[PDB]
Design a protein around this ligand. Sequence first.
Ligand SMILES: *[C@@H]1O[C@H](CO)[C@@H](O[C@@H]2O[C@H](CO)[C@@H](O)[C@H](O)[C@H]2NC(C)=O)[C@H](O)[C@H]1NC(C)=O
Ligand SMILES: *[C@@H]1O[C@H](CO)[C@@H](O[C@@H]2O[C@H](CO)[C@@H](O)[C@H](O)[C@H]2NC(C)=O)[C@H](O)[C@H]1NC(C)=O
Ligand SMILES: *[C@@H]1O[C@H](CO)[C@@H](O[C@@H]2O[C@H](CO)[C@@H](O)[C@H](O)[C@H]2NC(C)=O)[C@H](O)[C@H]1NC(C)=O
Ligand SMILES: *[C@@H]1O[C@H](CO)[C@@H](O[C@@H]2O[C@H](CO)[C@@H](O)[C@H](O)[C@H]2NC(C)=O)[C@H](O)[C@H]1NC(C)=O
Ligand SMILES: *[C@@H]1O[C@H](CO)[C@@H](O)[C@H](O)[C@H]1NC(C)=O
Ligand SMILES: *[C@@H]1O[C@H](CO)[C@@H](O)[C@H](O)[C@H]1NC(C)=O
Ligand SMILES: *[C@@H]1O[C@H](CO)[C@@H](O)[C@H](O)[C@H]1NC(C)=O
Ligand SMILES: *[C@@H]1O[C@H](CO)[C@@H](O)[C@H](O)[C@H]1NC(C)=O
Ligand SMILES: *[C@@H]1O[C@H](CO)[C@@H](O)[C@H](O)[C@H]1NC(C)=O
Ligand SMILES: *[C@@H]1O[C@H](CO)[C@@H](O)[C@H](O)[C@H]1NC(C)=O
Lengths: 49, 49, 146, 97, 181
Amino acid sequence: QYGSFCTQLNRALTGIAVEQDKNTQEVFAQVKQIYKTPPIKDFGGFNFS
Amino acid sequence: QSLQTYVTQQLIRAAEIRASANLAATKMSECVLGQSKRVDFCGKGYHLM
Amino acid sequence: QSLQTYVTQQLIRAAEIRASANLAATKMSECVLGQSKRVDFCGKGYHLMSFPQSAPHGVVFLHVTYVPAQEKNFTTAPAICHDGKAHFPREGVFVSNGTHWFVTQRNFYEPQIITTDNTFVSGNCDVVIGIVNNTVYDPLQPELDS
Amino acid sequence: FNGLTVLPPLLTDEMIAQYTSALLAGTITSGWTFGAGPALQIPFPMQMAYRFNGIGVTQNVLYENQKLIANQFNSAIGKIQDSLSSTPSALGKLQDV
Amino acid sequence: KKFLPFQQFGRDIADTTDAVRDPQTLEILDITPCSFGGVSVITPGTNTSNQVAVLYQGVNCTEVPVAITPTWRVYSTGSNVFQTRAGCLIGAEHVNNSYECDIPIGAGICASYQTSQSIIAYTMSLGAENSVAYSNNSIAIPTNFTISVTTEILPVSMTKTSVDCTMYICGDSTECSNLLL
Ligand SMILES: *[C@@H]1O[C@H](CO)[C@@H](O[C@@H]2O[C@H](CO)[C@@H](O)[C@H](O)[C@H]2NC(C)=O)[C@H](O)[C@H]1NC(C)=O
Ligand SMILES: *[C@@H]1O[C@H](CO)[C@@H](O[C@@H]2O[C@H](CO)[C@@H](O)[C@H](O)[C@H]2NC(C)=O)[C@H](O)[C@H]1NC(C)=O
Ligand SMILES: *[C@@H]1O[C@H](CO)[C@@H](O[C@@H]2O[C@H](CO)[C@@H](O)[C@H](O)[C@H]2NC(C)=O)[C@H](O)[C@H]1NC(C)=O
Ligand SMILES: *[C@@H]1O[C@H](CO)[C@@H](O[C@@H]2O[C@H](CO)[C@@H](O)[C@H](O)[C@H]2NC(C)=O)[C@H](O)[C@H]1NC(C)=O
Ligand SMILES: *[C@@H]1O[C@H](CO)[C@@H](O)[C@H](O)[C@H]1NC(C)=O
Ligand SMILES: *[C@@H]1O[C@H](CO)[C@@H](O)[C@H](O)[C@H]1NC(C)=O
Ligand SMILES: *[C@@H]1O[C@H](CO)[C@@H](O)[C@H](O)[C@H]1NC(C)=O
Ligand SMILES: *[C@@H]1O[C@H](CO)[C@@H](O)[C@H](O)[C@H]1NC(C)=O
Ligand SMILES: *[C@@H]1O[C@H](CO)[C@@H](O)[C@H](O)[C@H]1NC(C)=O
Ligand SMILES: *[C@@H]1O[C@H](CO)[C@@H](O)[C@H](O)[C@H]1NC(C)=O
């Protein structure tokens, strides 16, 4: 008898849920290829271990 | 009423989290993928990497 | 209760739209009215210029950027030892094609003869690790001899 | 259990780690070139000399003091583990959310 | 749970009776909710086809055939059902090949419609692999360039809407407005 009070709540929660994945994607997926360091650590004395 | 209060507070918190994530994405683009001249944006001192 | 719910949701959405509009104003100020040095702010690549374009309830930016295309392998040297003195390039990088050494700018291949106006002398060549070992030219001397 | 569910994130933790490892490897092996376009390799001391020129210090300063700079960087990167482990409130921003 | 001799129920969150004691045989048996979850339909556009896949979110799906005439239950039993961290997917085929995600599912699993053509499920690929030929005396400098133009779209303004309170609540009525004041 209250109409569509329930649908809006679920819609808002789903919007938040989608926004979270958008946030993670926009922060971390900034590179289009996957790069790997060479097996040799000749960095002129700089230790990145 | 309890459900509506929960949803409203969740929306406000999600907005704040989105602002923080936008700042993090900007920092990843500027401090990590380049060298920034903006003062105190990438730590105290003259930014190197 | 229905009216209150509608008003609250409108307020939240208006706050989001205001954040977007502030970002758009910043982009108009920094990408269109000038040349921006911030990375990835005005498009992918090295920013050159931008052009605004009006859209319904929004704006569109066309970002003109510079992208390097074709690269080549070379060998480098941090410095050059000529007469016991170490030479460093003023602006550019020492590069070799296998037999000779040149100075080029970093973002585009343009080899040049290593002379005293391309490099500056600082200290002695006993401290630099990996220094390479060549001749530099002073254009004043050949003119004086002639 | 009263109608409440938690949904898994689209990106697993291993995928985030792979993304960060790719970013780190690109930064170490190519400097800032992999962000503008194709990645171009450059020796790390020369990249550091470029950064020194960027902050307004001439590049022979780094070549004359390379060992000291490397040692200072290694010590500084070693200290941060203890700095963040010793203080419980270092990672408070995530704990609050 | 070690019940004390004078105790009858068990409550951990103070609104749910997680345990109870049988009246006749004095034995203690815990109570758990049967099962529940959301039902999502993975579908390409009604352009491409009419085949669909169904995901039962966050459930062990030995239970799916007997959950809840529209009794598809196991919609396509031939389509190998398999558990993911989001649930189990029914109507899609598992594939080893990895591609860029287009229809996200969860926990790194993505679904797509491709060639004959059917809905497949796979782990998303983060991008093409690459390795920079790093050495301590090698440089790469570009010998050419390209000029590129890219578009960026930003919303600026919303629609200016005004709503009258009395007209919406108590339209053209005086008793309603007197009660509303
Ligand atoms: C890079 O630094 C790590 C320390 O973080 C070095 O690992 C140490 O190695 C020595 C001897 O090889 C051990 O006694 C230490 O216990 C190690 N420390 C740790 C934390 O594992 C590593 O050897 C360094 N690598 C280079 C190439 O210098
Ligand atoms: C590296 O570049 C140098 C400079 O151009 C080349 O030396 C010249 O080669 C041309 C042949 O194309 C000759 O006509 C010039 O007389 C050379 N100049 C000098 C000063 O000797 C050299 O051949 C190049 N090496 C390689 C392997 O490409
Ligand atoms: C560049 O040329 C000079 C030649 O003058 C080389 O200097 C010699 O280095 C060796 C090794 O220490 C000494 O034994 C000689 O006495 C040096 N020569 C003179 C005249 O003092 C120098 O080694 C060359 N550079 C490189 C990197 O090989
Ligand atoms: C740099 O790249 C451009 C391509 O963008 C080259 O221009 C092309 O050159 C070929 C033949 O050399 C022509 O058939 C094309 O029509 C050209 N394209 C355009 C858009 O004009 C250019 O030659 C390259 N430069 C160097 C030095 O390699
Ligand atoms: C540069 O050298 C590396 C050495 O492994 C090679 O893989 C790469 O293809 C070379 N690039 C060019 C343009 O010759
Ligand atoms: C580069 O590494 C080689 C070993 O692969 C070494 O012989 C050489 O001295 C190094 N050069 C510099 C400048 O570090
Ligand atoms: C009393 O309980 C036992 C089992 O606990 C049951 O078999 C029996 O029928 C019960 N008594 C009556 C009168 O039903
Ligand atoms: C959707 O279907 C119609 C029917 O053939 C087709 O003409 C239309 O182009 C399709 N939409 C897209 C985006 O391709
Ligand atoms: C629930 O699923 C797991 C696999 O995730 C399986 O080992 C277990 O047997 C299942 N439980 C039941 C009751 O079928
Ligand atoms: C992928 O290949 C492995 C063998 O390397 C096999 O065991 C597995 O079943 C395959 N999975 C799919 C979905 O093809």
